[PDB]
């Protein structure tokens, strides 16, 4: 399976150099479960990642998010796994108020990946939070 | 192959803006290598110590120039092969023997920030080539 966020950060920082870090991210991506051919459709497409990206978020029998995704770009799929780890086992509202910025700063991703890659990472985060917000946002009564 | 010359190659590396762009450029250089002749890929032209399958075939044409072709099992290593071919482009065996690559690898910081084996594999292919070059350099061309 995928390590929790605490272990991800510790293993990442334990890598002796950036090639090891880069291949570790890709390795995690390859560990993601296969995406149902049925879910690999436009409805689940994410734009702005310089590649094909698919992400599906659904709530189980309880109110906890279950995330699945894929990318035709290995490094992008790895970033998908990194975000899944950080948002793992959270309710929609937990995802909305969870600040991931400090985790990425510690990993120093934006400083080692291409700007285009970093933008793709921001796009998926924004897309996941958007989906989490649509499930928890307030429909204020003064707006009915 | 259609690749920049040493001089251009170096400038290109200097322009890389981040670890990833540089890493992928090395992979790109490998992707620019012509495919090896169907089974030119022999245990003979096999290089060892590159933490992967590496093949390099050396040839000397009618003009005494060394022509090199290669391929690797690992994309990054194949990029390192491409770099080596560019450095030795259009050289005679003797040229390859007295060419000090050290200053070039140093300015490119080629294997820096890569896993340890990369610089080991790089050293492997260089000694392999220099070895063959020296052998040929003892038997001189015409003039």
From Swiss-Prot, chain A:
Highest taxon of the lineage: Bacteria
Chief location category: cytoplasm
Biological or metabolic pathway of the protein: Cofactor biosynthesis; iron-sulfur cluster biosynthesis
A Gene Ontology term for the protein's cellular component: sulfurtransferase complex
UniProt-listed GO biological process terms: iron-sulfur cluster assembly; metallo-sulfur cluster assembly; response to oxidative stress; sulfur compound metabolic process
Keyword annotations: Cytoplasm
Pfam families listed in its UniProt record: SufE
Keyword Transcription regulation: no
Catalytic residues (UniProt): 49 (cysteine persulfide intermediate)
Location within or outside the cell: Cytoplasm
Molecular function via GO: enzyme activator activity; sulfur carrier activity
Regulation: induction: Suf operon is under both the Fe-dependent Fur repressor and the oxidative stress dependent OxyR activator.
Regions annotated as coiled coil: none
Function: Participates in cysteine desulfuration mediated by SufS. Cysteine desulfuration mobilizes sulfur from L-cysteine to yield L-alanine and constitutes an essential step in sulfur metabolism for biosynthesis of a variety of sulfur-containing biomolecules. Functions as a sulfur acceptor for SufS, by mediating the direct transfer of the sulfur atom from the S-sulfanylcysteine of SufS, an intermediate product of cysteine desulfuration process. Together with the SufBCD complex, it thereby enhances up to 50-fold, the cysteine desulfurase activity of SufS.
PANTHER family: CYSTEINE DESULFURATION PROTEIN SUFE, SULFUR ACCEPTOR PROTEIN CSDE
NCBIfam families: PRK09296.1
Stated family: Belongs to the SufE family.
Assembly, per entry: Homodimer. Interacts with SufS.
Protein name as annotated: Cysteine desulfuration protein SufE
């Amino acid at each position: 399976l995928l390590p929790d966020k605490e272990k991800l950060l510790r293993n990442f920082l334990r890598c002796a150099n950036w090639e090891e870090k880069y291949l570790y991210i890709i390795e995690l991506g390859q560990r993601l479960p296969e995406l149902r051919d049925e879910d690999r459709s436009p409805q689940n497409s994410i734009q702005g990642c310089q590649s094909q990206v698919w992400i599906v978020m659904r709530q189980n029998a309880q109110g906890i998010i279950e995330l699945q995704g894929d990318s035709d770009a290995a490094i992008v799929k790895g970033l998908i796994a990194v975000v899944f780890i950080l948002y793992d086992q959270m309710t929609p509202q937990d995802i909305v108020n969870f600040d991931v910025r400090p985790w990425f700063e510690k990993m120093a991703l934006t400083q080692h990946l291409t700007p285009s890659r970093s933008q793709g990472l921001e796009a998926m985060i924004r897309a996941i939070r958007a989906k989490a917000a649509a499930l928890s946002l307030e429909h204020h009564h003064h707006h009915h």
